[PDB]
């Protein structure tokens, strides 16, 4: 099937200003994107805020004032902090979105008329924070902003209530086989792995049905009415999840602006996600939930869901109050956008709650994209080795010319199997193992020393190495997609050539093409001190 490849962000809760967990989830969608345009496919990414809800809406009335403005405010935050982090995302929605709840009361019709929906009770405990429905297995003891003691989430640790009332709940617990089904028949659709066992001993277990809808005073109105039952709002969830469908339906203008929803998913060719990015704690929503409701509704199931973990700068957790903050845009002010992204892509996999420092941050900074990248391109496009400012015309390769030759020709169909899984930090290192092989091939050939004693052998030499770095910079586009476009001005790289699955062929730019401009004292990255 050809269709518009489908890559989506969790949509957030406004009831606080956007940080790193949310540009870092937002930023994952956005390199997958990416990939895959600069591999020539059409791509449609999509973020956004989750903007009702109990917790949103007493966000909101902590802060005093209405709802409305309060999610519009908020929303305004993260639109203004994603465009600041230079995303190409292709589209923002947010639940508030008219179209959006239009979309909400077409699947609950359609949950409905399958018989999915009935009127029952939930009688249980419940975290507003998590908007989470809970087992007794789930709490325990704790303490509440007083310190006086109550219940908590295991899985998260804010206070739980117990909820008595009439709601209308999804008959979950019919598709538990369905659900493994498609687990078992799609061994790669949950990622990394451990959290598709994790979910497929989850349902095993076995399933409850689930509250799919509240009564209105206690979401103090603020959601989308039930349709034909004005007393009852629809799950904060199922609200949330809709969006992804929303998404694959609305046609936006070049401002970014939606302007139709059609009635039908396939006229716009995106639906269904083809990877939904999430944070762990969000897990059983995408994998168990909304699954179970696109089955209900004869909607086609994702493709994947790879779920990541949590951050902690110095090892501990972010807050403002504890005194540990990581603020995306003031590190990337002090040390650079791309460089960021490399790092937050590059020090942890998915399976692993990373860790921040300065230290380690300009460790990598420096090692990496500094000595190992940045020094290398600088060289080849030098004056000194490069001495005509050109792309040379090999002469005949070494068994060594060859070996390295080799590992170019490979690397992108074992960056694009890392990309595709994806484990992004894989692809990154798989990159750069190609690039510290580069720069050893150089300390060998001493390509300096070639420059004045042998000519024709330095035009392979140099050759070669202007090749590695092209293959490589393309490959890493995704991950610095600004210096990547610097590195292609240097090489003299044209346009055309900066993209598509031809041009990571080994030899695509052709010998004679003319290297960029120089400047003064340009450079790429520039080394940062210790302390
Ligand atoms: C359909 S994704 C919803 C995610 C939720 N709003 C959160 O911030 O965790």
């Known amino acids: 099937v050809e269709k518009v490849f489908f890559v989506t962000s969790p949509i957030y809760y406004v009831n606080a200003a956007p940080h790193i967990g949310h540009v870092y989830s937002t930023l994952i969608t956005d390199v997958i994107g990416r990939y895959h345009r600069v591999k020539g496919e059409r791509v449609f990414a999509l973020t956004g805020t989750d903007e009702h809800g109990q917790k949103v809406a007493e966000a909101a009335k902590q802060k005093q004032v209405s709802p409305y403005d309060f999610t519009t405010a908020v929303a305004g935050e993260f639109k203004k902090c994603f465009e600041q982090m230079d995303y190409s995302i292709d589209y923002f929605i947010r639940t508030t979105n008219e ?3 239009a979309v909400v009361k077409e699947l609950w019709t359609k949950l409905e008329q399958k018989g999915d929906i009935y009127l029952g009770r939930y009688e249980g405990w419940y975290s507003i924070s998590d908007e989470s429905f809970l087992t007794p297995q789930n709490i325990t003891d704790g303490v509440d902003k007083d310190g006086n003691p109550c219940k908590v989430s295991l899985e998260s640790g804010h206070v739980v ?29 949950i990622v990394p792995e451990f959290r598709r066992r994790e979910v497929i001993r989850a349902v095993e277990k076995g399933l409850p049905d689930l509250s799919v ?47 139709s929803l059609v009635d039908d998913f396939n006229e716009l060719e995106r639906f269904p996600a083809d990877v939904h990015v999430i944070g762990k704690d969000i897990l059983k929503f995408h994998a168990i939930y909304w699954p179970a409701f696109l089955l209900s509704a004869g909607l086609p199931l994702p493709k994947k869901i790879v779920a990541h973990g949590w951050w902690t700068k110095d090892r501990k957790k972010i807050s403002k109050s504890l005194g540990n903050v990581f603020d995306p845009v003031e590190k990337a002010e002090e040390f650079g956008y791309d460089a960021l992204k490399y790092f937050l892509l590059r020090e942890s996999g998915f399976s692993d709650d990373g860790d921040y420092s300065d230290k380690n941050m300009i460790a ?7 000595d190992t990248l940045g020094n290398l391109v600088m060289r080849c496009t030098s004056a000194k080795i490069n001495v005509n400012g050109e792309w040379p015309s090999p002469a005949a390769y070494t068994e060594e010319d060859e070996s390295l030759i080799q590992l170019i020709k ?3 169909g074992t960056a694009d199997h890392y990309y595709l899984i994806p484990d992004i930090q894989k692809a ?3 990159v750069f193992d190609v690039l510290r092989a580069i720069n050893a091939y150089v300390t060998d050939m001493a390509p300096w020393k070639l420059v004045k004693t042998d000519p024709e052998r330095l035009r392979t030499v140099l050759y070669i190495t202007l090749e590695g770095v092209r293959v490589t ?29 031809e041009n990571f062929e080994f030899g695509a730019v052709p010998p ?5 401009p120089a400047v003064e004292g340009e450079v790429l990255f520039s080394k940062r001190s210790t302390e």
């Open 213 to 259: 809808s509240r009564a209105r005073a206690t979401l103090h109105n603020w959601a989308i009415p039930v349709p034909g039952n004005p007393d009852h709002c629809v799950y904060v969830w199922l609200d949330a999840l809709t969006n992804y469908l929303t998404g694959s339906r609305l046609r936006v203008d070049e401002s970014g602006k939606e302007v």
């Open 99 to 101: 179209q959006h709840k």
């Open 428 to 430: 990154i290192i798989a």
């Open 512 to 516: 004679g093409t003319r290297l960029g």
């Open 410 to 412: 490979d690397l992108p």
């Open 364 to 370: 990598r900074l420096n090692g990496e994209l500094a």
């Open 473 to 501: 910079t393309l490959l890493l586009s995704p991950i610095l997609p600004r210096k990547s476009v610097v590195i292609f001005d240097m090489l003299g790289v044209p346009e055309v050539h900066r993209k598509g699955i």
């Open 161 to 189: 209530t117990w909820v008595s009332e009439e709601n209308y709940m999804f008959r979950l617990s019919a598709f538990r086989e369905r659900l493994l089904e498609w687990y078992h028949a799609n061994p790669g659709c």
